Amino acid sequence: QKVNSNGLRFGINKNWISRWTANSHAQTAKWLIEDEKIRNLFFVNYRNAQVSNVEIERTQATVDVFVYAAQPAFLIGSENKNIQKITKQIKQIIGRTTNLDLTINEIGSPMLSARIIARDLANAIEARVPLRTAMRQSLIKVLKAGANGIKVLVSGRLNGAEIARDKMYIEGNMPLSTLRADIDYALEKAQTTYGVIGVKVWINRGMIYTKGLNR
Amino acid sequence: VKYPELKIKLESYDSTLLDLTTKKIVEVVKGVDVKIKGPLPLPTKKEVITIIRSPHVDKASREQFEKNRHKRLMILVDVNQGAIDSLKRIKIPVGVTLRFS
Amino acid sequence: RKNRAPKRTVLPDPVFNNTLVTRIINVIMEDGKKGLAQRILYGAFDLIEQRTKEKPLTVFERAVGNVMPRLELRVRRIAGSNYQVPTEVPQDRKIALALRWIAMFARKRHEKTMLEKIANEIIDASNNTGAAIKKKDDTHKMAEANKAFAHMRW
Amino acid sequence: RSAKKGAFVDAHLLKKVIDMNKQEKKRPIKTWSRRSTIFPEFVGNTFAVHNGKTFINVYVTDDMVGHKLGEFSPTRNFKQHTAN
Amino acid sequence: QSYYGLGRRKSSSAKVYLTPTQDKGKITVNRRDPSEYFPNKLVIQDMEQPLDLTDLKKNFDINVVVKGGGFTGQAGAIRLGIVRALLQFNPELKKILKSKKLTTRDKRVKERKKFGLYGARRAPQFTK
Amino acid sequence: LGIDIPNQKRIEIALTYIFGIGLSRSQAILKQANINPDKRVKDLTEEEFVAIRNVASAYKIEGDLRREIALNIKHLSEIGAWRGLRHRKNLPVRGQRTRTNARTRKGPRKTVANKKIE
Amino acid sequence: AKKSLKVKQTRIPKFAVRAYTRCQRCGRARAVLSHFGVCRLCFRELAYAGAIPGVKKASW
RNA sequence: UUGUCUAGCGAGACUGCUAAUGCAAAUUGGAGGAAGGAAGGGAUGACGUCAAAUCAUCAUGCCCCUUAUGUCUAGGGCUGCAAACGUGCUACAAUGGCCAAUACAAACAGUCGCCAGCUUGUAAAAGUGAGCAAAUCUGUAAAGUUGGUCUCAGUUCGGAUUGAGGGCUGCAAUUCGUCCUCAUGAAGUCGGAAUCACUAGUAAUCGCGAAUCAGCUAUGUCGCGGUGAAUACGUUCUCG
RNA sequence: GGUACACGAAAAACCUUACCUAGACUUGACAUCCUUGGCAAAGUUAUGGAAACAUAAUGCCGAGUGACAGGU
């Protein structure tokens, strides 16, 4: 079908999820096989964290895991129990050879990000929720909270029928023909008792032409 | 002094991110020391990763992701104490890796 | 339905000063090289003044002027017994067809080293002995043979 | 050939063939592989080699120094061509 | 006056120094003979074409250093360099050298070879 | 020993046809035996022809070459073995496919219709 | 046999002829990248998510 | 006989101003200019079409074994062969072939490697001896070209294939990595009904590196390139 | 046929691999929990074997028991 914006207009306009580099076939294998697990865990284990994006920051066996979240208290928490829990989890998933020093930072109106919307929609789908009402509420919450037009499509089973007829939403200006529009994208896989349902959301962060690279 | 003529190459995965570090080195090295070689671009020995789209038959259309291993050579010809003090504490962005002698 | 497109003609061969020369060099193209067909054409001219003596420039321009065709035939069919209808073409395709004819009748032959065979081929095509002039005569004579079907043009 | 450790045997197929060649010619041994480099010290005996199937006993010969055991074990069969 | 140009035809890179001095205009491409650098074919005069339009081998001494291209590739490199130095002499002759298609780079270079395109543009086929 | 063939090309090239002496060992002879190239020359000297047929035998005798080849073919085909088995059927033995290939030993093509299904 | 693939990657008793590299998440050493230790489409979706250094659609 | 260079940006190219047409928009010409008007390539692939491909990323709904379809080492096939599509290479040759040398990169890879230069060699290579985590040090860049020959031959095309013996890596190289000293000169001397890709670096074509790989009968392909045209009237056949 | 083929495959000595025959393996080869510690066993060189598989042998590190892990 259509291309995904988070790979189309990426690398020139949007900041990387993982900022690291190295020479060829020396040590990039471990880093690339390691960053994905942490990225997936930050959305699966900490569902309530509401991470707009995790900034993986690796340079010669040291990682500075940054998080952009609406409230630090999701991962910082009261009495610093959330911070120690997340630090120990990421340390056990990263080993003792790499420091963590993770930080959580506020991001301006995180609803203009796609990862949280995709993850929450997947959790709703795999929780056996009415798809119509859940999609309506997600669209309302993502349009009302200060974000521009949205482009949501849920493919797979529609909880009873319409398997090959994916429910695709189109709101506001969503030009994939544009190459600088800050159309953030994220795909997620809901593991429900009907298999896996794929949710993809394009969210407009405001046109990114001549806007730089920082997310 | 303090390891003179320290050949510090810089390589990154982003285009502007590495030239930014090179310019930061060339500007921070001045004001405390003069006549230092600045931006010295290299062939930037990158690699191209060709990946197919479908999990099944496709080879006439397999797009490439470009882990562009850029490369800028930074050579200090005047290695006064302030120049290399700034050099060792350039504090490049984390996406930048320095090969220093 | 695409229409008239901006076809481009590259700079002439700057060792003989003729665009037809470079077109011939780039139509008999083997292995992709022009340093190849340039040597081919130079040796062909050398053997031309060796056997069947004639000035390369005059003979080349005469061949270019003469071997060009007159019209083209478009295939037309309705129910059965398909036929041809005359049509006019710009001279660019005429000299292109001359290029293709020379390449096809030169690159393939026995009768050893290619130098003398291509020299003989171009000389025969030049002096109106049938190697490409026969096609020009036929396409004129073809229109008056199937004129009963040529008239049926829409 | 291999030309770099190209005359190596796993030292466990080698033991049985060394013993059996020197008894008189004893054929059956439970040394099944394709890695036994042929040397003139293995003459007269057969190996229960692995053709991708059960241990088939094939008569090994020793003429080359780089050719190997599986040279004597069949691994592919004829076409047995059919008209349709 | 010495003119400095840019020769990058066929993904090349060249320095030229056009000096209209008493020198005839010897083409010193990488400091070796053109007989081995180039064939004696159209290329041996394709290299001199910029001189051919500037009083061939009687003016504009061509001190040219190059890297990039083959035999006609290097000739094209020096050609673009010489014509661009001529343009640098006076920023008004770009129009008249545009017609010859030597300067005003027509981008004639083996473009980015695509995935699935074997001749760098040829698709396998419309497979039956 | 060997078959004497006249030359229209150089001597090495005339040797390329005969069995046991090919394009490369005759090249070695030509670079080592100081053989005059044949510029439209039928032959420099006849007496050397058969002599050349022996000099390449310094590397490996052509008769010995063919004798060893045939002896290995028969030995490794008669006994239980693989290389001789694939050689006797006239198919490639050094790992060349036969699905749409290996027909360099099967002849150009022997078209026979195969099984068709609905 | 995804477990078999990874275990055959890891365990080597005394024969290092069984050497190769593969993805530690989904195996499939066919079309793997020893540069990145990962298969093809998983790499592609990871880069689409933006978690891979250098992400663009055939920019050359 | 260095500010090309490599990589970033700015000016710029954006109908900018003029004339013209077009009720509009929009288009053509002319200046500066890299291009005069989406500037050549790539990406950008909309509802849905084939209920196309995939349970083979993975997740798995369902259907399937569990002290056993899990795991496993070892070995073998995945290069079988009468056969038929398709990709290229490579040739059907003298534009070339073999022999020796030569110029060039865009670049990319390389510290069981790349190896300069050098010794042996008809070599996969046997090694001496700098340098390089990589514009240095290297990977023949070659085709092109230079000099001899070949006189259009089943050919000095084409290296396909196979055996006597070795070489790179890897416990093991026969099968299934491989190539070479030596052998071979297959088929194919221009390709049927029927067609596709391909419009300025396009096809065609020749190279350097590499993806998996311990290593590779990838000649390929993937990236970068080197040589390098023509046509495109027009929808008449034609197809979406 | 489009919607597959120098394809998914960007490598076929075994691995890569999915089958093949040859060997053990029974919470099992790996793995969550139960269970037991400071000396604990993946892999080691001989060694039947081709190697698991028992070994003599070593790493703040691990074995068995039923629930379970695994599935190109």
Contact (CB<8Å) A21/B96: yes
Nearest residue of C to residue E49, measured between CA atoms: C14
Instruction: Please state, as a whole number, how many other Cβ atoms lie within 10 Å of the Cβ of residue G16.
Output: 7
Domains held by chain G: number: 1
E115–G60 CB contact, under 8 Å = no
Stated in angstroms to one decimal place, the resolution of this structure is 16.0
Cβ A121 vs Cβ A201: under 8 Å: yes
Query: Crossing angle of helices B81-88/B15-28, nearest 10°?
Result: 150
Q: What are phi and psi of C32, to 5 degrees?
A: 90, -10
Task: Give me the phi and psi of A28, to 5 degrees please.
Answer: -70, -20
Report the alpha-carbon distance of residue G46 to residue E26 in Å, rounded.
57
Domain boundary assignment for chain D: 1-84
Q: Are C24 and C44 in contact (CB under 8 A)?
A: no
Q: Which of A17, A20, A21, A214 to mutate to test the interface with B (most CBs of B within 10 A)?
A: A21
Rounded CA gap, B73 and B98, in Å? 10
Residues 18-77 of D with CB under 7 A from strand I: 29-33, 35, 50, 52-55
**CA dist., res. G44 & res. G31, Å (int):** 12
Tokens, residue C34: 């022009």
Q: Is residue C40 part of a domain?
A: yes
B95 contact G CB<8A: yes
Q: Judge: E41–C35 Cβ closer than 8 Å, yes or no.
A: yes
The Cα–Cα gap between D17 and D38 comes to 11
Q: How far is the CA of B62 from the C1' of H193 (A)?
A: 36
**Which residue range is the domain that position B55 belongs to?**
1-101
Distance CA(E57)–CA(A119), nearest Å, equals 73
CA of B83 vs chain A CAs: smallest distance (Å): 24
Q: What residues of E are in contact with residue C35 (Cβ under 8 Å)?
A: 39, 41-43, 71-72
Angle between helices A28-44 and G40-49 (to 10 degrees): 60
Q: Which residue shows structure tokens 């479908």?
A: B54
How many domains does chain E divide into?
1
Asked whether residue B63's C-beta has any atom of DNA/RNA strand I within 7 A, the reply is no
Query: What CATH number is given to the structural domain containing C49?
Result: 1.10.455.10
Q: Closest nt to D7 (CA→C1')?
A: H172
Q: What's the gap between Cα C57 and its chain centre?
A: 16
Domain that holds residue E41: 1-128
Name which of G43, G53, G60 is nearest B51 (Cβ-Cβ).
G43
The conformational region for residue F4 under phi > 0 = left, psi -120 to 50 = alpha, else beta, is beta
Q: How was this structure determined?
A: cryo-EM
**How far, in Å, are B31, B88, D44 from residue B4 at the CA level?**
19, 12, 73
3-state secondary structure of A128: coil
Which of D72, D81, D83 is the closest to F79 by Cβ?
A: D72
Q: Three-state SS for D83? A: coil
- In chain C, the number of structural domains is 1
Residues 41-60 of G with CB under 7 A from strand I: none
Which residue has its C-alpha nearest to nucleotide H125's C1'? D3
Place of tokens 């030169």: C106
Residue C144: inside a domain:
yes
Q: Which of A202, A191, A185, A187 is nearest to A157 (CA)?
A: A191
Q: What residues of D are in contact with residue F79 (Cβ under 8 Å)?
A: 59, 61, 72
Q: Which two tokens stand for residue E86?
A: 């001529």
B99 touches strand I (CB under 7 A): no
Q: For residue G29, give the nucleotide whose C1' atom is nearest its CA.
A: I16
Residues 6-65 of B with CB under 7 A from strand H: 9, 11, 15-16, 18-19, 39-48, 50, 54-57, 59, 61-64
| Residue positions forming the annotated binding site of G for Zn(2+) | 23, 26, 39, 42
* F contact test, residue of D51, D60, D69, D72 with most F CBs within 10 A: D72
Interface contact G50-A12, CB threshold 8 A = no
- Give pairs for F16-22: CB < 8 Å, separation 24+: F18/F62, F19/F62, F19/F66, F20/F56, F20/F61, F20/F62, F20/F63, F20/F65, F20/F66, F21/F52, F21/F53, F21/F56, F21/F62
Convert B11-42 into a string of H (helix), E (strand) and C (coil): EECCHHHHHHHHHHHHHHCCCCCCCCCCCEEC
CA-nearest residue to B58 within chain E is E116
Total domains present in chain B: 1
d(CA A16, CA B14): 9
Question: Residue A24's beta-bridge partner residues?
Answer: none
3-state SS string for chain C: CCCCCCCCCCCCECCCCEHHHHHHHHHCCCCCCHHHHHHHHHHHHHHHHHCCCCCHHHHHHHHHHHCCCCCEEEEECCCCCCEEEEECCCHHHHHHHHHHHHHHHHHCCCCCCHHHHHHHHHHHHHCCCCCCHHHHHHHHHHHCCCHHHHCCCC
D and E touching (3 or more beta-carbon pairs closer than 8 Å): no
Contacts of A97 (CB under 8 A, 6+ apart): A61
Question: Which residues in chain E are closer than 8 Å to B62, comparing Cβ atoms?
Answer: 115-116
Interface D:A, ≥3 CB–CB pairs < 8 Å? no
Q: Is D8 on the interface with F (CB under 8 A)?
A: no
Owning domain of residue C77? 19-151
